[PDB]
Nucleic acid binder design. Structure first.
Lengths: 205, 123, 80, 129, 150, 82
RNA sequence: CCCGCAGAAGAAGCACCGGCUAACUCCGUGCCAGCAGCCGCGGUAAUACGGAGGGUGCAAGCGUUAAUCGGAAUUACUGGGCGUAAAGCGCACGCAGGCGGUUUGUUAAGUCAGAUGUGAAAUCCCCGGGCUCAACCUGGGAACUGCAUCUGAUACUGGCAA
RNA sequence: UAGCUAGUAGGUGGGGUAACGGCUCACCUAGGCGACGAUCCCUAGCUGGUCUGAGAGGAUGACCAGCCACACUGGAACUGA
């Protein structure tokens, strides 16, 4: 029900940093990125069309830490909502509670944020939410409880929040350790390199 | 094709009957395996293929392939037939479920283990 | 008013009764062609004024025999 | 025998556009002049002219924009073998609105735009694309 | 800004005097990403010479398409030899959802989000030829209004 | 006898009762003449918990319908407004 | 449901890796053992068999089998064909049937527009609400493409008269 | 599977039912249904719906709800709204 394995291997099959070990240090430096996703990893794949579509879906799931039935349900919900299904799908992945806890700098990675969410260290709107996939509405206040406030992790995580780009659709404020999800993220406000038409076309075959 | 001709007599695609009269279209059936054979295949292949002939529980006497390397079937040995054609033998339409009623799992197997009735080796 | 139908006499020979064919003109559900379609009805008339080949209006009433739940109102267009 | 003179008219116009014909004559009727008036109004033909006294003859001066022909594809929809009567909601648009569909409504012979604006459906005669 | 991609390579044969002789055919489509689609066939004795002749023929023999915002305009049907092909503008009907060998020409064509369904034969050499014929005889609202006055 | 009565429709350990007008010898969640309101015994402490069409209820009691003890309790709860 | 305790401590499999189809090498076997949905692999260096290492896909599931629809425009109403691929009766006459040039008038049956009654509730869809979320439950609407009746319109089709 | 039907089709009168009605009986007429598929044969509970489908359709009708039928098998009535 979640991955639990070598993370930088997943980041190495995709060829791109999936932010799976954000943590203390800088850019990887001990990953052997691009070089060998397994034993025959030095081989160029010469990847197919199914391979590029598949590999795009796997990039997105392995970023946000979602498995397939849950992702597939996000595609059905993004499909039925009015508008653009790629952009709706990223809006559904960005409203996840573990993601919003990661974006605010409360967790160093999304797995650490998922353990903060999971171990009842996070309230939304003054109610404790235990669930990684809670869908944070706009104009909500998500914060850390009094237990697990001033624990080392979150402090260190806010320390590495300043190294990243400070997302526009949040009120990050780390003094009180509370945040406000203000609006839904625009497609132009996130990541610029994921090709969601490939995963629309992957599920539409 | 003219719409009058279809009002007089509509389109009708045929029924496309079943490859496997395991009757009622049940997932498995059980049978008694009246005998055990080895049978030579069709022309481009050559082997001796281990195949039983089975009196099912619904009356039908059908022949059935036995998967994997080596079996313990002999003539009474109540087995669970499955459904699935072996193209290389003329007229077998079924398989035996290994790891079922009187059909043991394949000895010393480690991969694709579930489809041969073999439990996980303790390690 | 009352709901009535119009049709033509298809046969005559019965003892104070008649039988009337009705022509409903209905679109085929699959093919979209408007097709003629009949409805033969055993219709009552007191004193059997209408003969074969007529055109007659007809209303529904209580049962008067087996099938027969229909009775004429106006014989029109008898022309032979 | 002739059993659909409208499809005959549209055949005359397809084969006149296809042969770079300047003008097209045919026997005339009220429905053909109604359709021809819709075609002139919507810009698919240049002009029409009904002559004769006892045997009227409709004449359509055709259009050619460039070397290409203006009437790209004219089709007969409600043929005599199978007539097609659409409501005001079922009333189709051809080439996503770039191409009219001549519907005979109770108010007269109109286009799809004009009869969907008038709020009434009818018998859809031909697609002009 | 050329955006080339190959669809199909095949091994054809000839059958001379002494045995057979095997040649390779490419089939590529180039296009800028805003109309301007071409395809080229090209055949040669090895595969990279075949693709190079195909690209070189496809860079010339390139056709204009009157796109909409990012997509087609009206539904269009193009036919070639045995290969009948439908397309539907799918006004932001997200993603290019076309068959094989039609996804490529629609991809480099610059269209983004149409609905397709090839019928008939679906030989790749004739399913393009039935997409360009198709995208070629698809005209814009400023062309139809040019033709018919307004 | 026609009865204005409750009919259990929510999930397990979470009932939602719909007050209907049924011929009394039908099943509970079976055939009814018309539904006329609802009653959620939880709902949350928000706004309603219960709405109930008093005009149609007065119509059916005018016809001769009987009322169970809960529906009488709900009409005694929502008296005219509160 | 809330709080406290102790400690990462009790908690990961299953299929697949020749092409289709994401994912590759070594060893054993040598037309055997066996695999296989189709194409087909195996007769000594097998990316197809059996094992190992590695990888891929799913995940408290995963595969196989049975069954349905899809793909299948391979029954084609939407939406196919018939010189040679299957397919034009050996040729005609003709009843029932289907279709029917052109003008005017009337009708208004088909057709169209509106109204009313009905089309049970649930289910599907939309906008909300409650279970920590979700599944689930639920409020209101839309929908139920229909039928019947009444009111109109009269271009087309039909009836009638010329 | 091309003919089926003699209470059969209709009429008059008597009886019967809560109620019309060949529902039943006597008499009279010789009809009625059928290629728009009667009769015979095989299968089947029906629907709201469910699954699939872009759709039109195709398959199906487990749970939930409406209707029908049955209560070991064949038949009959009694009590009773």
């Amino acid at each position: 029900a979640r991955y639990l394995g070598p993370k930088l291997k997943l980041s190495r099959r995709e060829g791109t940093d999936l932010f799976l070990k954000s943590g203390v240090r800088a850019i990887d430096t001990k990953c052997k990125i691009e070089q060998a996703p397994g034993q025959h990893g030095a081989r160029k794949p010469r990847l197919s069309d199914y391979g590029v579509q598949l590999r795009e879906k796997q990039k997105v799931r392995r970023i946000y830490g979602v498995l397939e039935r849950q992702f597939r349900n996000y595609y059905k919900e993004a499909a039925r909502l009015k508008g653009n299904t790629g952009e709706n799908l990223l809006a559904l992945l960005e409203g996840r509670l573990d993601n919003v806890v990661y974006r605010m700098g409360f967790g160093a990675t999304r797995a650490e944020a998922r353990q903060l969410v999971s171990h009842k260290a996070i309230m939304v709107n003054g109610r404790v939410v235990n669930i990684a996939s809670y869908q944070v509405s706009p104009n909500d206040v998500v914060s850390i409880r009094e237990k697990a406030k001033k624990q080392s992790r979150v402090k260190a995580a806010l320390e590495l929040a300043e190294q990243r780009e400070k997302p526009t659709w949040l009120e990050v404020d780390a003094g009180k350790m509370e945040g406000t999800f203000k609006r839904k993220p625009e497609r132009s406000d996130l990541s610029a390199d994921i090709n969601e038409h490939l995963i629309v076309e992957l599920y539409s075959k | 094709a003219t719409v009058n001709q279809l009002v007089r007599k509509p389109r009708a695609r045929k029924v496309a009957k079943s490859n496997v009269p395991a009757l009622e279209a049940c997932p498995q059936k059980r049978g008694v395996c009246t005998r055990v054979y080895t049978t030579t295949p069709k022309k481009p292949n050559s082997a001796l293929r281990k195949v039983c002939r089975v009196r099912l529980t619904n009356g039908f006497e059908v022949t059935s392939y036995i998967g994997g390397e080596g079996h313990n079937l002999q003539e009474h040995s109540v087995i669970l037939i499955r459904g699935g054609r072996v193209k290389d033998l003329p007229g077998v339409r079924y398989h035996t479920v290994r790891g079922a009623l009187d059909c043991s799992g394949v000895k010393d197997r480690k991969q694709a283990r579930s489809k041969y009735g073999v439990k996980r080796p303790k390690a | 008013k009352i709901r009535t139908l119009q049709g033509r006499v298809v046969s005559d020979k019965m003892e104070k009764s008649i039988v009337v064919a009705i022509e409903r003109f209905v679109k085929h559900p699959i093919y979209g062609k408007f097709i003629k379609r009949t409805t033969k009805l055993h219709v009552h008339d007191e004193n059997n004024e209408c003969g074969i080949g007529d055109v007659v209006e007809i209303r529904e009433c209580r049962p008067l025999s087996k099938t027969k739940s229909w009775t004429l109102v106006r014989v029109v267009e008898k022309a032979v | 025998s002739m059993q659909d003179p409208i499809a005959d008219m549209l055949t005359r116009i397809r084969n006149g556009q296809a042969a770079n014909k300047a003008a097209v004559t045919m026997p005339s009727s009220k429905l053909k002049v109604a359709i021809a008036n819709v075609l002139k109004e919507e810009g698919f033909i240049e002009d029409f002219k009904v002559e004769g006294d006892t045997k009227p003859e409709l004449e359509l001066t055709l259009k050619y924009f460039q070397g290409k022909a203006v009437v790209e594809s004219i089709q007969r929809v409600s043929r005599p073998g199978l007539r097609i009567y659409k409501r005001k909601d079922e009333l189709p648009k051809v080439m996503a609105g770039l191409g009219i569909a001549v519907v005979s409504t109770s108010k007269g012979v109109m286009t799809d735009r004009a009869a969907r604006q008038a709020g009434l459906g009818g018998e859809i005669i031909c697609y002009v694309a | 800004e050329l955006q080339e991609k190959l669809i199909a390579v095949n091994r054809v044969s000839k059958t001379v005097k002494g045995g057979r002789i095997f040649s390779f055919t490419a089939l590529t489509v180039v296009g800028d990403g805003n109309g301007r689609v071409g395809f080229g066939y090209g055949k040669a004795r090895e595969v990279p010479a075949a693709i190079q002749k195909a690209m070189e023929k496809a860079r010339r023999n390139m056709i204009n398409v009157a796109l909409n915002n990012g997509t087609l305009q009206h539904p269009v049907k193009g036919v070639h030899t045995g290969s009948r092909v439908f397309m539907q503008p799918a006004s932001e009907g997200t993603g290019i959802i076309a068959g094989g060998a039609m996804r490529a020409v629609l991809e480099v064509a610059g269209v983004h989000n149409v609905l397709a369904k090839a019928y008939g034969s679906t030989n790749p050499i004739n399913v393009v030829r039935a997409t360009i014929d198709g995208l070629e005889n698809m005209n814009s609202p400023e062309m139809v209004a040019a033709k018919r006055g307004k | 006898m026609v009865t204005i009565r409750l009919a259990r429709h929510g999930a397990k350990k979470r009932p939602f009762y719909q007050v209907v007008v049924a011929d009394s010898r039908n099943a509970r969640n079976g055939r009814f003449i018309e539904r006329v309101g609802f009653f959620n015994p939880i709902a949350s402490e928000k706004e309603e918990g219960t709405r109930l069409d008093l005009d149609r209820i007065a119509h059916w009691v005018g016809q001769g319908a009987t009322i169970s003890d809960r529906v009488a309790a709900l009409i005694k709860e929502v008296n005219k407004a509160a």
